[model samples]
Target: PWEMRERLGTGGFGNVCLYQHRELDLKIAIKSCRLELSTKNRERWCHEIQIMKKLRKLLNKPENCCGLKESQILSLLSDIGSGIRYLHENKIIHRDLKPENIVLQDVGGKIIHKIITLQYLAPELFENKPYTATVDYWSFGTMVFECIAGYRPFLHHLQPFTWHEKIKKKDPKCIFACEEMSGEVRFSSHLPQPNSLCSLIVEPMENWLQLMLNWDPQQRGGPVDLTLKQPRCFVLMDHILNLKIVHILNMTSAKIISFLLPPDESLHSLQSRIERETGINTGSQELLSETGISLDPRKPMVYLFDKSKTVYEGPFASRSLSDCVNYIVQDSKIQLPIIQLRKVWAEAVHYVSGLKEDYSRLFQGQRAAMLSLLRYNANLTKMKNTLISASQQLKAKLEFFHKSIQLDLERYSEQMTYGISSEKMLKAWKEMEEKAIHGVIGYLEDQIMSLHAEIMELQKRQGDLMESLEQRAIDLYKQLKHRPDSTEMVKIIVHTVQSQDRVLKELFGHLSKLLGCKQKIIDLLPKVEVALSNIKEADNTVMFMQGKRQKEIWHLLKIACTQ
Candidate 1:
């Protein structure tokens, strides 16, 4: 059985206690879940236990790593930068970072700090939005400012949310003062002298810190900013880790895995160690260099890394490991990465438009086509349903032509039973507003709908007259040859002339009626125009009246608050 001992600490999720062990023999720390914890959280909760199972030590150092020399600051920053950059490259974010999470272990001439920090959360977190790797940069930047100054850029006088809002208001200048962030004497009143940070920090580090603190996320340590415009803090990190991390990539799966070892270790040792992790024999493994190039496509790619030889001792030793490599494969299954010195990355924008014109004009086009026909325009001759070239009196284009004439009439039904010329037009047509004037605005709307109907009616009559001609021609053709043609010359001539003369007279009648309807639609359009102006005038004035009332109400609320 486990023996419970003294309490260690209380965390956000649960309280911590020390335990004894035989099986539970020595001193050990145990932090437990809340009582009545759900099964849902049991596995997740045990994850911390499993993670703690693979545990560690080393804390108890400086209260803060401030008032440090550039050498120490750069060294500490290098380690922190390397870990964060690795996390960011893998698309993993270290959301909570502060000095507390960092576990510093100092050994002889070398030092190691395991990142783990937050009073250091990004502002983007406070504002609700999708975030990116730049968030870690803000956290990193804030800590660096802490190392530079003896304290943080912003005060810890208030709760974190209030402190964050205070930072957002004025970009911090490195002077402590009354009416500064701690204006109301909330925390310590120790003000920083103008010379406190002056002449102390180097130019390269200061410039780098300014960039990391940019309010816009992309400007703050995003890929392009890290890659081509590599910051000094980052460069120092990569320089230290270059020999410590080796990337091994599988071509088929396209996944790259990292192998970590001492800088003094040999290539043979690397291959020997890799052999245990995979079934592939050490001799069968050929290492591909990320910086290797090509000449003849028909031939195999040369310039591969010789395993017996090492990366540090080779011609590729001088450059940073990250830029010189991307992938390693058995084949160029894309070494295509080697030729990658093109344009660097940047943000982009594109406007999405033109879709409405592309997909929605079917009905709108029909309206225009209707208008052109009603107005008796030039394209009438270029129209359809195959209304030309007569034939064997009955087995012909005549009936179809008559139907066209019928549709032409129907289109102008551009009026309805009691005279709603176009019900659709009235429904679609509305002034900027309605019900603005008690009865006055309402009255004009009815008039507009009615007048719009009348205008359509004028076009409808044009359509109707065309239909009448088609009906006349079709009926005469049917009467003439509902059965067959006369064989005798005298009989054929009599029937043919009779039918031809009848159509000729009706066609002339259609022409006269169409011309008259076109004239009528034109005259009625002016009348509708007058109604439109009247409706617009009344509605627009009421809009001003209603707007002033609302504006007055808005002022009333302002006055209430002012008092």
Candidate 2:
């Protein structure tokens, strides 16, 4: 329970009174209503009370504590736009919008607010005309006018009930028709100075006011207009109201560039926009401050730059859009000299010609190398096939030699046995001689064939080397005047042939010795056979002579014994 200090005000549905709490000793306003808790009027009253309490507290806060800067005014309007969007989306209309119900509190840089004011009702509500959210726009515009000019427009002190009657009778000056009126507009001294007030009511704001304050509710602009049309308008107004300075410069190209930016926007973002609009690459450019120091791209560019000139001086990486702009947009003393350009062009032409010549040489060399490889591969294939054929032939000859030796051994074994002693002995000697001939000759032939295979393999490799040399000669002939390595190739071939001659000579020497030894044995075998036969014949004759002598001797002995 608290004691009522005074009756503050009375309204259609409720009365507001000032009260002091008995326990807390705090002064507060209490609004009492006659509507029942279940009624829609009660709901509206309750909602309005809630909104009013919030606004009251905001109004009571210290000016510096909340800090109502000009920038914050835009922020505040943006806040109202958002709330209106919400109400319109939900099919609800805030029929009233005025400073009395509007609340603002900035706690730790973030803004909070609420809105409600019955006296700021639009004309349709008084006329009992069916209305939409557009009525809110009219009220909003009226409230803005009051905020700036410090008084409401048209019907400032008139009662809400009398508004429609006066409008029907044309008893009051028409809000839509009045262009200039006495005591109609006023301003608070607290407004920003140096034409700050003029700056705050910018063109966009004026345009918005015209659109919102239209007499026909259907013609009024709403929350969408606030968001879309005036998105950057408020920010612009803040700058003008704050009265900051910006530097303007004319480039050599006759293009003017501005160094001003919004406090909330980064220089990088502005540079990006400039790049997009002008098709200039900003990545290579650096923004310099007034003191000739490069500005950080990451920070916002709220302040103006001092006297600074973009200079261009670099061979490569340090060149930038700023440099290009400076060079082209303004008359400058930086450029490549004509003589130096000529020298550079001459050098470039010489280098390019030399490179082209070298490239041609290398290309021809590559082609020659490729042809050499193809030739080598073809030669290698032919050599391999020839070696295989030679190996096969050598294998066939060795097989024949083996079979012949077996047949000769069989024939010799049969002939040596079943004969007279001298004859048999002689046959045995012949058999041994045949075996020795076949074994030694067969072994030597096999060894010679194997050596021939080794020689053929060496010759094949030598042929490949000669083929490679021939290809190299062809390549060099196309690129050079004389053949130098060809002479060396001839010498190598001569050395190889000489080595082959020595090997063949050694083999021939062995062949001659083997042939001589075999021939001696062959010749001695037949002579020994003839001698054996002669000896056999002589032995038989001697036996016959002995038989004759024995007979005569026996006859003489018998005659003597009879006498």
Candidate 3:
């Protein structure tokens, strides 16, 4: 079972909660939305889940990387395209697509990603202009541009114009014009100079960007076309297996997963490294930084760092002067022994293993119980078949007895010399017939008793099984109470219980019918017994009347002869 713990994040729609599984000892995140059952929210939730699953798989692929190479960047673009193509093929449109929505995390020291973001949309959503899946392509183009430029490429000044005003403009100057061509253009400090990136990168990169950042949405190259038609697209995938070393830096709130060069390395040599990794044509031109401060194409990276203090710490742990100062201030400085860390890790593994075993045992027990229930149902079926057969036989016997009585009456009528009717004889015959009917009622009572016993036995077993399953669920919840994977296990258990409950309900329906039949049998039994007793007394009275009838028949024959 899942025990809800901490709130991980909150958004406009809903909040995400961290839950631990009691038995599994696994951590899981569950998202809850306001007005959860609302169609818009449900549809959006489902869409996000479906898209994220595909993206997650792609990110997990061993070949994919966050390497700072043209080919690596291309590979990332290709993966994103593949996902978008998959969505489009399935006729799903992702209206909102941005870096904020696309989550990135370090998996085994490699960057893995899953998208998570939604919001109440704006004017474009309500606007008269139609939209399509291609809208995602526009976002994809913007995202790709941002990766290279270190920020989104578009209208430069965000505070000046509204979103609608920006879109309405014939052509945004920042997007259309090169920095040198345009006079006195403003720049965001967070964004890298686009002109410097354009000059530094090869022609193929620009070509790819041109297609993606096309003015017309229809003209933009899709994932398939880009992967197939673009020159030297993700060719480094074949050679990526050779590069073993991965540089991963965990920042205050972000992680950088890529290959980094040594401190003694020059920016020019670093530039050459990219040229080798991508196998692209760079026209033998020197690359320069946008801001003409630290990186001289000729100067070593060491020139940027003042001393050894700015150089190294843990594996590739080098920060700028400002960053180092901030780190010292923010450092908690809580240290633990290596031995203690190892011991704790070992204990955690052992605990997880035990939980797995318990879950396995619980599953086995439930499977066995399920098989037993099937057998019980089979037995009930057999009993029902037998009852049906008996009922048919009883009906046939009653029909034959009625026919026999009719034939006897006809024979007696033909043999009689005079038409004579005795009320006492008729009444006695009726009592004999009533006693025979009571016999059938007794047979029904016996069948009801057998059914009752069978139902009681099945109910007892089912009740036991149901109680056991419920107890197991409770125990699982308790075990996962503090664990992170609790919610996932809880969901599994809940589904299992729902399925079991459905089965029990159906079985109870049959049991209820049996109880009703048993009640009816009980109610009729006493009345049938009383009728049978009256018939038994009438049997003796009827036999004496028959003796008198014999005397009368002789007297009637003599009188007929004398006359």
Candidate 4:
């Protein structure tokens, strides 16, 4: 007997809950088909139970060429190939093989995440086609895909409803098939479309998927094929080679760039409008307290980001629409439907002229700010050049003074000759020479010290200038980050202007239709009124004749009197 655990998931037809063995403590998933008491369901339920027992046996030995790993989840598959092989061998057929039929067992925990085979209905089954084992493979494939992606891939094919009743009765009548084509049915793999099997399992499994999901029943691989080929990467070279290799980034024609800019004076006002529309608070802490509101303006309605945790899945998903609009929209979010998104991507073409116009203005402002930043950069470059030139000149002048002092010192040694004059003359000359030499040395020393101080001051000033320039550069960087490219902004403005022009065109079309309707109504209304008047007068004359003939009443009530 199985001990029941809390329900894990639910669907329209049934529910899935975890089950544990009362004694063994082994866990498994139990799914009920919720079928009515009927002979057909009895057969289906018995078949599923037999499949589960067969799967239990597979967990230990897997004698029928089930060479899959202990952790390969083969138990869940539960002799899908062998079960199908058995059914086919016994001439039994299962038409449908959706997820609802498959019951997952303990193999998933040990090593092999295996499923209990259950749902296996075919389209023919809907159209009175007999159940077949081959149909189970289709359901198996779909379940494998769904488990990996966490949602049914066929959802888009059905109308946006959970069940048939909800779709047909609750909503308007709509098409549910993947294609409008008469004979073609849904495929497990297709181009640009979500095929859960191919995406989650097949693409990863490579060759195994190609072999298992073969359209031809005869070509489909069974237990023998599964046992022979282990799920190794290199085994499926042919399938991998044939797969469509696509360069995803090259598809986009637009170039994306990020920017930073100084906050606008009207930013507060702009944010207020956003706050009003989104019902959020855009104010700071103090302002929020003052206003008695604690809401965060930057927080998303669906999934908010905490800045502390840099990476999150739900936040990214929530912002997917914003990303699409930024990349795909020409101007702004419009009230138009999805069909009109691409056609009027630019703001100038959107129906909302005010939004388009405001965005256009913003675009223009962004461009202007970028241009100013660019001009500042150009001027900074010129200033840097001028500073370099001034420093070089100062260096040259200091070098010249150094060289002159060195030359004078060198010449003094050669000038000291003792026999050049008399002893007295020599003595006087020596004293004068000593004084002159000392004075020259002292003067040169003072001059050198003074020049050194001047150069030091200049260098300090130069450093200050450099520091200022660096700060200026940083400021420029901050400004440029806010508005990197003028081109994008101009394009935005152009788009808005263009959208307004289109709106005007559309308004003209609407006015024309309204005018035509009005003129037709005007032409018809008077004629209808006149006809009614004539009919009333005819009835009154008849009534007068009737009164004179019958004489029962003094006179027939005139039509006007009746009125």
lDDT of each: 0.43, 0.43, 0.43, 0.36
- Per-residue CA lDDT of model 3 for 307-376, tens digit only, reads 1121112222122223322232244142334332222222222223323332333233333333433443
What tens-digit string does per-residue lDDT give for candidate 1 at 1-563? 66777776664367676777647468755666766666667776776566545401222112112243435566666677767866666556767676656655568977787654247778887786788777788777766656655346565434777676665664432322123323463322233321123222333444555566554666676345345565554653454434344555432122335554676666666666667775446644544333322122232211112223221111111111122122211121332322121100000000000111111122132233344434333222211111111112222223443353345336435435646344433332222122221232234334434544654664442222323433343333334323331112223223333443344344334333433444444454454455445545544554453455345446556755887
C-alpha root-mean-square deviation, each candidate: 37.8, 40.2, 29.7, 40.9
For residues 1-563, could you state the per-residue lDDT of candidate 4 as single tens digits? Answer: 98887876663247777788888978765666675646667676777678757532332221111122212433344444445545555555555354444343455454323223222233334334444443455445544434333233243334433323221232111112233235343433432222112233333453344443332343333444366442222234233333432111100111111111224424345346435743334432111111123235454201111212212121011111233344443444344443233322222122222333333332332233233333433443343344344434434543543354345334433444533222443354344334323232234334334433543343221223333433343343334424422233334434444554454344334333333332333343344345434444544543443343234222222422655
The TM-score-based order of candidates, best leading, equals 2, 1, 3, 4
The segments of candidate 3 whose C-alpha lies over 4 angstroms from its true place after superposition are 22-25, 34-75, 117-129, 160-164, 167-201, 222-563
Candidate 1, which segments miss by more than 4 Å at Cα? 1-7, 16-30, 46-66, 69-71, 104-106, 109-111, 116-118, 155-159, 171-201, 222-233, 236-563
TM-score of each: 0.33, 0.33, 0.33, 0.26
- Clashing pairs in model 2, backbone N/Cα/C closer than 3 A: 252-329, 252-330, 253-329, 290-306
* Candidate 3 displacement at residue 105 in angstroms: 3.7
Error of 3 at 310 (Å): 30
